[PDB]
Amino acid sequence: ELSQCDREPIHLLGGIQAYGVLLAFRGPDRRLEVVSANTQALLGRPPEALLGKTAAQVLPAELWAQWELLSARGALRVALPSGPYRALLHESDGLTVLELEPAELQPDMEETALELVRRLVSPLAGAKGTRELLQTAANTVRALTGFDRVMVYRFDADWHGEVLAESKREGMDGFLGMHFPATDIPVQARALYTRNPLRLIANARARPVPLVPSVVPELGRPLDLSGSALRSVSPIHLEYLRNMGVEASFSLSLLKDGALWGLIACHHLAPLHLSYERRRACEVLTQLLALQLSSEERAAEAAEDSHRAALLGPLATSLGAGGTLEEALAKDGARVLELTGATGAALLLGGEPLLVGRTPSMDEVEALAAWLAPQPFQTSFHTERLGSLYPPLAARADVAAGLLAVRLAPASSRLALWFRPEAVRTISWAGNPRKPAEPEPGHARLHPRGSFQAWEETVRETSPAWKRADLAAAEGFRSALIGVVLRQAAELERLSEALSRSNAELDAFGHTVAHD
């Protein structure tokens, strides 16, 4: 593929954390094909000995009494001599696997989750703004998890990320408003996190615990761990955290109708374990954030569409009065521009092209109109930097930074478009984007960024991104160009009664030659 950062498989690591013990059951005969190598403390027997025997005589006597509801719903609490343990059950890779982990110790915690979900679902939330919703979710995440530093991470088109908001406690650095390279998150990571919503790495210094046996005898590969929540992450990502200085990690993915909208991040300077109940409560909390944001964007787009219609109102009303379309646009050009938020407009109906406001030279516009012919689009065209697609205008980007074009007609040569100037924008990177990874002699792998200090770069010949409202405003301008062009048709309609008058002029000079 592109790099070792992607070709590396994540399913087949076969690494398990030291917190719990993983056990496996094979079909009806209850075969323990693969077991953890740290089961001596819990199971009281050597790990290698337990291979190949039945589940009837190996497990502690307690949890068969709890086996029924474990097979029913996959969760319970069981008492053990070492202490209270949390039991989860899931079946994957054509085999049944069982695991045990420590559980909570504060019974008062459970009602807190209900209280906080009530607070979040309570009305008047989101009216304050979209941005504050992320912070008022992150602060509650801090309270539930009790971690140190929490960011909110949002994905861009090219899979690079930004920090929309964060909530921390005093005494640590913050990455608010910082961007990160797209390659920092591998593609296989996105594919895996599409299915598994959450994950937990409570220690960074811990060595991975080997899985015995190394490979399943008949599968030919080690046991899959995607379904389990105790998987050990790749060692490469560990050095990234260690250089970052984080000891414990906890991330929850946000899903929007099949799209990885963003990730919640949590960090800690010291190792700290966390229970399954807290994880699931946090997951339930994060699930409603997508719905809240959906409601917010529906309301915002409704307001924007209403505002665009309101602005369309008087522009259409003024058109149709005394004058011609070229006269009307020239006289009423002030109200034209704000529909698309541009600085110049151009229309081509068959005559010489007409320009209003800031625009490229007269000779260039028809060259562009010809240039727009072959690119396949049906209604609209978009660009934030036309210089890539069309080099000649990149020489003078003062008005050619961004263009929005629309088909007034079918594939024939009739078009209208708008122009935008360039806006300076400066962004701050964490490390050098040019060197996302630090190479090592021997090319065994690619080490992560050496440092994490803020670094700034400036982009030029770029226009602010086209919104979604102006895309509909283009169709609105088409619906307003009708009406004014229909008044053109009405003035041509009394030119049509003047065509009846022209036939009257025909037979008028007819009876005039009759008279002379």
Give the residues across from 394 on adjacent strands: none
**Nearest distance, CB of residue 196 and ligand BLA, angstroms:** 9
Closest to 168 (Cα-Cα) out of 246, 281, 255: 246
**Nearer Cβ to a second copy (28/123):** 123
- b/e string for 384-413 if b means 16 or more Cβ within 10 A? ebbbeeeeebeeebebbbbbbbbbbeeeee
Say which entry of ligand BLA, a second copy, none residue 237 contacts (CB below 5 to 8 A, set by partner kind). ligand BLA
Give the residues across from 168 on adjacent strands: 149
Say which entry of ligand BLA, a second copy, none residue 10 contacts (CB below 5 to 8 A, set by partner kind). ligand BLA
- Region for 146 from its dihedrals, namely left if φ exceeds 0, alpha if ψ lies in -120 to 50, beta otherwise: left
User: 288 CB contacts (<8 Å, ≥6 apart)?
Assistant: 117, 120, 121
Amino acid 234 reads S
Say which entry of a second copy, ligand BLA, none residue 372 contacts (CB below 5 to 8 A, set by partner kind). none
Q: Is 184 in the site for ligand BLA (CB under 6 A)?
A: yes
Contact set for a second copy, span 47-106 (CB under 8 A) = none
Among 388, 412, 428, 453, binds a second copy (CB under 8 A): 412
- Cβ neighbour number for residue 138 with a 10 Å cutoff: 21
Among 203, 243, 251, 292, binds ligand BLA (CB under 6 A): 251
Q: Is 278 in the site for a second copy (CB under 8 A)?
A: no
**Rounded Cα–Cα distance for residues 216 and 220 (Å):** 6
**Nearer Cβ to ligand BLA (250/477):** 250
Give the residues across from 268 on adjacent strands: 248
Asked if 419 contacts 400 with a C-beta cutoff of 8 angstroms, the reply is: yes
Length of the chain, please?
516
**Nearer Cβ to ligand BLA (199/280):** 199
Task: Write out the DSSP string of 215-249.
Answer: S-TTTSSPPP-SS-S-BPPPHHHHHHHHHHT-SEE
Q: Is 410 in the site for a second copy (CB under 8 A)?
A: yes
Say which entry of ligand BLA, a second copy, none residue 407 contacts (CB below 5 to 8 A, set by partner kind). a second copy
Stretch that binds a second copy, among 63-71, 383-391, 449-457, 487-495 (CB under 8 A): 487-495
Q: How many helices (H) and strands (E) does the chain have?
A: 14, 21
Q: Where are the alpha helices (DSSP H) in 319-425?
A: 325-331, 334-337, 362-371, 386-389, 391-394
Residues that bind a second copy (CB under 8 A): 110-111, 113-114, 117-118, 121-123, 197, 255, 257, 280-281, 283-284, 287-288, 291-292, 294-295, 298-299, 313, 316-317, 319-321, 349-351, 378, 407-412, 414, 475-476, 478-479, 481-490, 492-493, 495-496, 498-499, 502, 505-506, 509, 512-513, 515-516
Residues that bind ligand BLA (CB under 6 A): 5, 10, 151, 153, 161, 180, 183-186, 189, 199, 233-234, 236-237, 240, 249, 251, 263, 265, 437, 446, 448
